Design an enzyme around this catalytic site. Structure first.
Site, short mmCIF file in Angstrom:
data_model
loop_
_atom_site.label_atom_id
_atom_site.label_comp_id
_atom_site.label_asym_id
_atom_site.label_seq_id
_atom_site.Cartn_x
_atom_site.Cartn_y
_atom_site.Cartn_z
N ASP A 136 0.82 -1.27 0.00
CA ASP A 136 -0.03 0.15 -0.12
C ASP A 136 0.90 1.29 -0.05
O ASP A 136 1.76 1.58 0.96
CB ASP A 136 -0.91 0.04 1.16
CG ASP A 136 -2.19 0.76 1.12
OD1 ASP A 136 -2.32 1.75 0.00
OD2 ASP A 136 -3.12 0.61 1.70
N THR A 166 -3.10 4.42 -5.51
CA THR A 166 -2.47 5.67 -5.08
C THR A 166 -0.97 5.95 -5.74
O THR A 166 -0.73 7.00 -5.93
CB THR A 166 -2.26 5.76 -3.42
OG1 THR A 166 -3.46 5.66 -2.96
CG2 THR A 166 -1.77 7.01 -2.85
N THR A 167 -0.39 4.90 -5.82
CA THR A 167 1.16 5.05 -6.52
C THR A 167 0.84 5.63 -7.97
O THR A 167 1.80 6.34 -8.52
CB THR A 167 1.61 3.63 -6.59
OG1 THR A 167 1.34 2.97 -5.50
CG2 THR A 167 3.00 4.03 -7.18
N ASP A 195 -9.37 -0.72 2.15
CA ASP A 195 -9.52 -0.30 1.00
C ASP A 195 -10.28 -1.03 -0.08
O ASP A 195 -10.79 -0.26 -0.87
CB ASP A 195 -8.06 -0.31 0.27
CG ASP A 195 -7.35 0.89 0.64
OD1 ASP A 195 -7.70 1.79 1.33
OD2 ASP A 195 -6.01 0.94 0.51
#
Lengths: 202, 521, 528, 46, 525, 104, 98
Positions: free
Chosen positions: E57, E90-91, E391
């Protein structure tokens, strides 16, 4: 140039020194800034009464544990509130409280001759102190019946006893002289005796 | 004698340091105005991370050793509190015009004639600005959106202006109110700025109601009401510990259970006194015990507690309700209505009470959906500036063309009046007039385009009339008329900028002696 | 959440002792302001209204210097542009000598105008050619301003008045006395077909009474006392010797080898008799003095006593060379007597007392010689130094005058002339270079302003008057700073003059320094 | 930036220096303000 | 400059500012490209105390590495806001931002003041946003849609078998929700943290599970059917708030005062047990009392003398949980009592986990509050699984919110690339240049995927772009053999509004980074 | 490999590549401004307080206090070029660094 | 003999920050450390399983042949050691032997 070549070879001049002191001082200055938030939840005992501005999540494990320790602390401190009135025991019994007064309990052994505004104001200050610290044994009496023919030019003399050992002394008005002497200064002196922990400006 | 560690200096070096620091500070924030603006970054002494492009908001974040720079920062915050925009403008004007004063000071001059030249100069150019002042009616929303877009043109969030600008104006009206029918008041403290992280810029807008980051105080209460009944209390429902001490001596067989019965009965009677004028929501800044809520569950009240004091003020103003302190004083006129819609919606991972007003509001709360607290802070500062200028135009319906053309116009006017007058102060006079147009060269530098030719053509065009509105186009580094571009700035803002820079210059050009290292006494 | 690191590249390699500046908005402006204040440092004084600047070196010698060249020699500065400017002034003084501060102030004015124009927004090149065109315009127009030319460099009052101008920039109380002395010294040695040299004039400082009790001496004076029992000889015959005065010692180890007694017996006798033979042969030339520099032997002194011979020993090869130059003698490598042609003849030699200080003196009553020196009487050494440098300025004035006779009036007339004509010319040029022409013109208006300030007089009136006069048609009229009130008069009738060459070299070196300063765009400073 | 001259200088000017000069001289004179004249005084320095 | 005024001022020029920002962003993107995708690396982040967490994450990756750069700080801040809002991919945010700045670097390497590039990027963003609005496909949520959405979006931060079991568990999870109310939020669903067994034993519970067990060795370890009494009434002892004391003359007076002290807990207990018996208690009709306050041992024994079920000190949200699980009405005082407040539970028992003793309530007829149980080998794995399920439920909520699913696995962004290329000879000028690289911007997304897979980049890339150019459909990236093939047909999608917000935030932060001109450390003088 | 000698700088492939690229970038960017009849004019200060005005690349390379492998290679190569031909040596470093930037 | 470290990841670390990357740094190091730890206590828990003793910081002696206690008292600076000891602890929470 030449100086730093000296530095590689010799130490005849000192100029690269003492640049670690302010470094370490600033390191500690930045370090000590987390103590404000480290014990934010570990000091106040009204945070439960501070709902809706202190709650984000309740883990109910360490926080109920905090209630448990807090209530133990509260019961321990409020089980000792037994005093608040300075008392006039007689000289006949005097041996029984100079010694049999309890171990682990401070004794403010006040001796006085009533009549001078010095002794009167000191008695007023200690009686008012009794209203704040009901965990301290106050003793007031006439020194004549406590000590035979005691010099009346040596009052009021403050005595601090515990287990028959004098810990603090305040002899005569030579350390209390002056009507300007006040509540907080007496409390400050008795704190300096090691009995009380408070804060004062001077 | 004199104490040890007190150094005392005089001579040319003090004014040298003064002017050098002034030009230095002016030479660190030059490239941030106009459409061509370049977005600065800075780090707080604490360790935070900020980025801005308006002057004082960031110039507050510098620690300096020399006194003149602290004076500069105080001037910057003065302009920030007064006008809220063009903060960099006054700073650069002061710096450049001090630089102009420097050379003149080197040439045998004494500050008395210099400050006399300032006083006459400022009088003259303010009078000229009064001459070129034109009022325009403020009843047009399109005008106000145009001015908001003109102001935000210096800001990078201009992209959303199409919507965002309108938002600003909305607040300027929906907070607007007057006490007892006079003294019209537009309180920004009543315009609370709340920001919810995440979401596009468009979803951010002013809501015709009040916003609070709270939730329901008990699961078994309704989570939606169309028209709740509004009451505000400023006393806790929990037992009040009185003033004195009694230490009841329980002597008889039993009074303790009687004591608890009396306590719960007092709670009951006050809660029922509240219910007497049947509400739907009770709101209070104080904590509440369980018993009051339990009693209110018969009356199905919303039962919200622990609200902020200024939030109480804002909600009362929006609802038009009043505030009570005793259940016994509860009467009719205090209970305001206007709660057109009420919701408790789960936004992201946090709850927010959504009261939507149906009647006329007199206070606004803002939703700001963005991407980070710093960007939201930027947009918040800029919208604060937006309402600032909106209300400024509201109070004063004056405008003059933007783009800095009026600088050169009044410069030419002062040139002509310097021709009219007779004296030697005409030299610093015209010189500071030339200092005035530091703005356009800064704009060209932002553009990085050709400078001298456009400057000269501009200068020639403004020595005659009919061109005063015509100004500098920073979009493409050209010269156009401002009757169509749209940049237009209020009269009072430039008045304050002029006065502020000139008075700062007058202050910095009198010192002769510095003494350092003394002790507070 | 920490301090900003250094960028990968330059910021990882500029050594701790290495610093860098790039971009005139942060790099060049530092140099410009540094040079401006450096010029301002000496801008406080020059010429008729200068003030001495007592400075103490790191060697603890107290230099009371008002000579800007001597000041800068004493000054220790670490700004590279300052080094540029100071070396420029150094070579200027080498070529000319007087008023080195004029170059300083001119360069400062040029650099401040450069900062102004480049802050306006100009680029380097165009304005560079602007200054260069203005400079060559000055190059051609200044010769047109040559008003007079010195004549014959021989009449004593002529050269006195010519040099008193440069002396007047120095000590102000009375230059005409020093003018008389320097003229008397210099004209006496007037070369005909050779070349005048500064080594042809010597100096003799003597601590004592006021400077008024000083004079000049055609010859040489030295701080020595003779070993000769006689002291005063007139029309002495001089036998200069360069060899050591003892018995000539062979360059290889020479050993006496004695076998029999008679060898010892006759040794000293024959030695002293041979010595007597050599000294007698020397005496046979008719010499009345003996000069040598090497080690001396007493037996020779005793023999000279036997013949009543003056003996003098010097200590500097410079002394021997200059003495041979002024008397015509020769450096004899052997003690053997010379011929009449290779010897020097002097009218009188004495050991004359000069105020409780005794010196050997070589005086020629004809006072022709080849080298002359000046006796100096002062209460302190620093006064000696100041007067000595003033005389240096005067003699450099005279020597360049001998190489060039065209005259320009100093002061302030020529400066305003050049400024006005450069401005008028700049009225006639098209393009983006006229501003540089005007700035170049107004660079050397500091000279009038400098004279106004350091005379304690308001400058707006005087500059307005100068321009009014120059536009009226008067072209030789400049400032007047003796009345201590704003007024002007013509330098030509004021005796304040100068040579075209000095001003020419000054301006050309000043603009060369300026262009070298301006072309430079990057700075990399090494460790102090 | 970089400083003009080498570190360790001192620069005081104006009437301050002028006065500060004169005073110094005065000191020395009062040290010997009694010697000459047929009265005559004597010092001692070790 | 200002450095003259503050000798302790660190100043970085505009070019220096860009250089340092670019270096920071390049480091960030180089270490982050190791993360996203089901093939991204899994790292060890360990603090000084030795606290170890193994994650895929990006956010927790950010917050347990050693960060130093203010620009990197801002990157982490915005990425954390994105993770807060949706928490997935998110990356991709930070990789996009970094490579946008890289292309801006490539172009600024030729002069070309960047504001033109910013405006060109804005215009291209607008056009691509409209293109995205067009390209998205809508299909109403169902079994297959949501199971595939979860199975796809889950692996960005967790491995495969866990993804499958989690998908099944979350399919069973979001069913106790309303039909059309959207009652889903973290306040309403709970996660159990219990280090009990391996990962093959994690399941879900429609009912509620509490960590508090019997306070006394007479309680019931298991109740067949229970009627629930949630209460918010103080039952423990309390002091009179005016500090009243006892004053008497006899020890029996002390006895009477003790009785007087106890009477109030006595009558509260009397009322409670009387209601219990009146409803019923006979014939295995268990009764449970739920209080969040203290209970005296006196009250404990008084209530337990007949073997009632009652506990203490649960989470305050558990009262909402129980109201929507048992159904009984909550209460705060016994002023008004009615069996309406009684809840119901179809089965209650206990199981002591190590030192801790657990109660479980289940068989809820209409459960509106459900809880999740996860048991793993140790702390790091359980933290990772908790983050993954958080998530994943975020993604399930995002899917079930709207009725539009965009295809995933690389098709949509190459589609945007080609479409923007088509639009490019209409952008009116050198901004097309930027727009060009702007297209190359999105170019990274499957490239990184290609990079992670080990396939040579340019060949697979041109294959994909040719496949999309020749057709008009959306062709996806193969992750087993690299051969281009459409991805929507195997059950691959991604959240529409999520990518919308992603593009929004990425562009805003990109222009904010590129518009910097001066970096300072003003202060600490 | 900080075990065989605890005090030894060991850098992997990308580390070496990145440092070489950064050094080359700095050098080339510095030397951009030193060619053509309209190049920028450089001033240098030696380790004594002596000033040289140069436009030459090798002078700049060997007057900078720079301690770096690639910079050393650059200094040696430009020294050889100045020895042999000695003109427009700027082109050498510009070409090398630009090719480095490309291949990056 | 002058060379800096690579800008980037090696330059955004904290002063006390350490790092291991790829098969080279992280993998060989943790594998060797784990082999060391396994070999340390590889002479017990058998019919002949030879008991090993240890002294703690608390200055209490412990003579144990089951790895549980001896590892739980022992402290490490290697994260993989924390992993393996936590695995053993989970086994103990499951059964608690061997």
């Amino acid at each position: 140039e030449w100086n730093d070549i000296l530095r590689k070879k010799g130490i005849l001049p000192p100029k690269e020194s003492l640049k670690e002191l302010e470094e370490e001082a600033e390191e500690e200055q930045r370090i000590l800034q987390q103590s404000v938030v480290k014990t934010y939840e570990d000091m106040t005992l009204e945070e439960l009464e501070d709902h809706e501005d202190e709650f984000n999540e309740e883990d109910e494990r360490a926080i109920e544990m905090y209630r448990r320790r807090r209530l133990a602390e509260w019961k321990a401190t409020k089980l000792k509130n037994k005093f608040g009135e300075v008392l006039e025991i007689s000289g006949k019994d005097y041996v029984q409280e100079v010694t049999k007064a309890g171990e682990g309990l401070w004794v403010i052994l006040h001796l006085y001759k009533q009549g001078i505004p010095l002794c009167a104001l000191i008695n007023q200050h200690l009686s008012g102190l009794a209203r704040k610290f009901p965990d301290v044994k106050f003793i007031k009496a006439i020194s004549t019946t406590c000590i035979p023919n005691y010099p009346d030019r040596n009052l009021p003399t403050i005595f601090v006893y515990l287990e028959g050992d004098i810990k603090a002394q305040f002899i005569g008005p030579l350390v209390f002289g002056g009507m300007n002497l006040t509540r907080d200064e007496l409390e400050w002196k008795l704190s300096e005796s090691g009995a009380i922990m408070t804060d004062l400006e001077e | 004698v004199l104490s040890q560690n007190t150094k005392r200096e005089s001579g040319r070096k003090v004014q040298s340091g003064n002017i050098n620091a002034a030009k230095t500070i002016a030479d660190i924030i030059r490239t941030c105005l106009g459409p061509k603006s370049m977005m600065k970054m800075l780090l707080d002494p604490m360790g935070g991370i900020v980025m801005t492009n308006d002057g004082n908001a960031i110039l507050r974040e510098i620690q300096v050793q020399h006194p003149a720079a602290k004076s500069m920062i105080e001037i910057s915050r003065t302009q920030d509190e007064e006008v809220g925009d063009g903060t960099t403008s006054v700073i650069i004007l002061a710096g450049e015009m001090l630089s102009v004063a420097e050379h003149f000071l080197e040439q045998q001059m004494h500050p008395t004639v210099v400050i006399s030249a300032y006083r006459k100069a400022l009088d003259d150019m303010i009078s000229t600005l009064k001459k070129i002042s034109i009022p325009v009616d403020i009843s047009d929303s399109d005008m106000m959106l145009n001015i908001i877009n003109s102001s935000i043109t210096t800001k990078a969030i201009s992209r959303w202006s199409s919507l965002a600008c309108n938002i600003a104006l909305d607040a300027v009206k929906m907070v607007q109110f007057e006490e007892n029918g006079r003294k019209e008041i537009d309180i920004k403290k009543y315009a609370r700025v709340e920001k919810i992280p995440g979401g596009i810029i468009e979803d951010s807008c002013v809501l015709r109601g009040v916003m609070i980051n709270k939730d329901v105080t008990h699961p078994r209460m309704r989570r939606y009401i169309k028209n709740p009944r509004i009451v505000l209390l400023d006393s806790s429902l929990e037992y009040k510990k009185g003033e004195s001490q009694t230490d009841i001596e329980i002597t008889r067989e039993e009074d303790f259970t009687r004591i608890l019965q009396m306590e719960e009965e007092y709670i009951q009677q006050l809660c029922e006194d509240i219910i007497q004028l049947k509400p739907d929501v009770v709101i209070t800044e104080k904590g509440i015990s369980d018993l009051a809520q339990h009693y209110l569950m018969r009356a199905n009240i919303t039962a919200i507690r622990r609200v902020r004091k200024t939030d109480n003020n804002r909600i009362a103003r929006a609802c038009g309700a009043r505030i009570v302190s005793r259940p016994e004083e509860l009467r009719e006129d205090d209970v305001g209505t206007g709660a057109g819609l009420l919701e408790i919606k789960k936004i992201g991972d946090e709850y927010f009470t959504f009261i939507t007003d149906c009647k006329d509001p007199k206070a606004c709360t803002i939703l700001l959906r963005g991407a980070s607290k710093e960007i939201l802070s930027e947009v918040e500062r800029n919208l604060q500036d937006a309402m600032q200028v909106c209300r400024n135009v509201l109070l004063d319906p004056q405008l003059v063309p933007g783009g800095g053309a009026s600088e050169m116009a009044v410069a030419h006017a002062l040139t002509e009046k310097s021709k009219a007058m007779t004296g030697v102060e005409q030299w610093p006079y015209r010189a500071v007039a030339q200092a005035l147009e530091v703005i356009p060269r800064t704009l060209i530098q932002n553009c990085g385009a050709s400078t001298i030719r456009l400057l000269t053509s501009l200068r020639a065009k403004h020595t005659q009339e009919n061109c005063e509105t015509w100004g500098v186009n920073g979009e493409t580094g050209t010269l156009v008329d401002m009757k169509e571009l749209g940049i237009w700035e209020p009269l009072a803002v430039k008045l304050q900028t002029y006065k502020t820079a000139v008075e700062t210059a007058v202050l910095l050009l009198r010192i002769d002696d510095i003494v350092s290292g003394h002790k507070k006494k | 959440a920490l301090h900003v690191p250094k960028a990968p590249g330059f910021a990882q390699m500029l050594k701790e002792g290495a610093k860098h500046f790039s971009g005139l908005e942060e790099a060049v402006y530092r140099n410009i302001q540094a040079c401006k204040e450096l010029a301002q440092t000496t801008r406080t004084a020059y010429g008729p209204n200068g003030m001495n600047k007592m400075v103490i070196n790191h060697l603890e010698k107290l230099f009371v210097t008002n000579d800007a060249a001597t000041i800068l020699r004493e000054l220790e500065v670490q700004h590279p542009a300052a080094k540029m400017i100071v070396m420029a002034s150094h070579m200027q003084e080498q070529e000319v000598g007087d008023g080195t501060n004029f170059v300083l102030v001119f360069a400062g004015a040029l650099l401040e105008l450069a900062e102004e124009l480049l802050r306006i927004g100009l680029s380097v090149s165009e304005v560079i050619e602007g200054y260069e065109i203005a400079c060559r315009k000055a190059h051609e127009i200044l010769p047109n301003l040559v008003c007079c030319s010195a004549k014959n460099l021989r009449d004593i009052d002529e050269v006195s008045s010519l040099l008193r101008t440069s002396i007047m920039s120095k000590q102000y109380g009375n230059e005409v006395f020093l003018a008389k002395l320097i003229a008397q010294a210099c004209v006496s040695i007037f070369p005909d077909s050779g070349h005048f040299n500064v080594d042809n004039i010597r100096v003799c400082k003597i601590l004592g009474s006021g400077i008024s009790s000083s004079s000049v001496l055609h010859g040489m004076v030295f701080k020595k006392e003779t070993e000769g029992d006689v002291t005063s000889v007139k029309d002495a015959k001089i036998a200069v010797y360069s060899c050591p005065f003892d018995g000539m010692i062979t360059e290889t180890k020479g050993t006496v080898l004695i076998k029999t007694a008679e060898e010892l017996m006759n040794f000293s006798k024959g030695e002293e008799n041979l010595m007597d033979a050599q000294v007698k042969a020397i005496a046979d030339t008719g010499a009345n003095v003996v000069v040598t520099g090497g080690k001396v032997a007493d037996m020779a002194l005793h023999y000279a006593n036997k013949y009543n011979i003056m003996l003098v020993r010097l200590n500097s090869k410079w002394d021997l060379r200059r003495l041979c130059k002024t008397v015509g003698a020769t450096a004899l490598p052997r003690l053997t007597p010379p011929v009449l042609e290779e010897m020097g003849h002097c009218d009188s030699v004495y050991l004359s007392e000069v105020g409780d200080t005794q010196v050997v003196v070589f005086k020629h009553e004809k006072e022709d010689g080849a080298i002359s020196t000046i006796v100096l009487r002062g209460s302190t050494d620093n006064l000696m130094d100041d007067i000595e440098r003033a005389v240096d300025d005067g003699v450099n004035t005279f020597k360049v005058l001998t190489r060039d006779k065209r005259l320009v009036p100093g002061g302030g007339a020529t400066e305003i002339e050049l400024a006005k004509q450069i401005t008028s010319y700049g009225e006639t040029c098209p393009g983006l270079e006229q501003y540089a022409i005007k700035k170049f013109a107004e660079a050397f208006e500091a000279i009038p302003r400098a004279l106004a300030e350091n005379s304690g007089v308001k400058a707006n009136e005087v500059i307005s008057k100068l321009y009014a006069v120059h536009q009226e048609g008067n072209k030789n009229v400049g400032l007047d700073i003796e009345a201590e009130v704003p007024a002007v008069k013509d330098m030509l009738e004021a005796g304040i003059l100068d040579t075209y060459l000095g001003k020419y070299w000054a301006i050309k070196l000043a603009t060369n320094a300026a262009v070298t300063v301006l072309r430079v765009d990057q700075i990399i400073m090494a460790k102090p | 930036p970089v400083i003009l001259l080498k570190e360790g200088t001192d620069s005081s000017q104006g009437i301050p220096q002028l006065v500060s000069n004169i005073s110094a001289c005065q000191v020395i004179a009062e040290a010997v303000r009694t010697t000459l004249g047929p009265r005559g005084m004597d010092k001692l320095i070790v | 400059a200002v450095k003259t005024l503050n000798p302790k001022a660190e100043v970085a020029r505009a070019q220096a500012a860009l250089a340092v920002n670019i270096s920071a962003a390049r480091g960030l993107q180089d270490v982050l490209r190791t993360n996203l995708g089901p093939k991204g690396t899994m790292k060890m982040l360990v603090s000084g105390a030795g606290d170890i967490k193994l994650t895929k994450d990006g956010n927790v990756l950010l917050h347990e590495m050693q960060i130093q750069h203010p620009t990197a700080s801002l990157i982490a801040k915005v990425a954390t806001a994105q993770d807060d809002i949706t928490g997935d991919g998110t990356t991709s945010n930070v990789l996009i931002i970094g490579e946008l700045l890289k292309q801006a670097d490539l172009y600024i390497s030729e002069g070309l003041h960047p504001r033109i590039i910013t405006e060109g990027f804005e215009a291209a963003k607008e056009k691509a946003l409209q293109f995205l609005e067009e390209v998205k496909v809508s299909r109403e949520m169902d079994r297959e849609t949501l199971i595939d959405v979860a199975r796809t979006s889950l692996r960005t931060k967790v491995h495969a078998e866990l993804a499958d079991v989690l998908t099944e568990a979350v399919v069973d999870s979001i069913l106790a929700i309303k039909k059309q109310d959207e009652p889903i939020d973290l306040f309403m669903i709970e996660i159990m943290e219990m280090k009990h067994k391996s990962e093959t034993d994690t399941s879900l519970i429609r009912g509620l599970v509490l960590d508090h067990g019997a306070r006394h060795p007479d309680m019931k370890k298991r109740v067949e059917d229970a009627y629930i009494l949630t209460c918010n009434v103080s039952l423990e002892y309390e002091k009179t708030e005016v500090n009243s004391g006892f004053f008497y003359k006899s020890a029996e007076e002390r006895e009477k005062l003790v009785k007087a002290e106890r009477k109030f807990i006595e009558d509260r207990v009397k009322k409670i047990i009387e209601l219990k018996r009146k409803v019923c208690g006979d014939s295995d009709k268990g009764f449970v009392v739920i209080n969040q306050k203290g209970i005296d041992p006196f009250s404990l024994d008084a209530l337990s003398k007949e073997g009632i079920v009652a506990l203490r000190r649960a989470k305050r949200r558990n009262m909402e949980r129980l109201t929507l699980a048992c159904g009984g009405v909550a209460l705060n005082s016994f002023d008004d009592l009615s069996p309406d407040c009684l809840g119901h539970a179809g089965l209650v028992y206990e199981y002591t986990l190590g030192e801790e003793k657990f109660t479980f309530i289940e068989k809820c007829n209409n459960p509106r509050s459900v809880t999740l149980l996860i048991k793993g080998p140790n702390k790091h794995t359980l933290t990772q699984i908790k983050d993954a399920v958080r998530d994943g439920l975020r993604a399930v909520k995002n899917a079930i919110d709207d009725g539009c699913v965009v295809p995933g696995a690389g098709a949509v962004e190459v589609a945007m690339a080609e479409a923007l290329i088509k639009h490019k000879p209409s952008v009116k000028g050198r901004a097309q240049l930027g727009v060009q690289a702007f297209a190359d911007a999105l170019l990274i997304i499957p490239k990184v995927l290609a990079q992670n897979s080990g396939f040579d980049l340019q060949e697979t890339l041109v294959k994909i772009q040719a496949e999309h150019s020749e057709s008009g459909q959306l062709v996806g990236v193969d992750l087993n053999t690299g051969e281009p093939m459409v991805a929507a047909e195997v059950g691959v999608w991604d959240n529409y509004c999520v990518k919308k917000q992603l593009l929004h935030s990425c562009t805003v932060i990109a222009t904010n980074i590129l518009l910097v001109d001066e970096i300072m450390r003003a202060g600490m003088s």
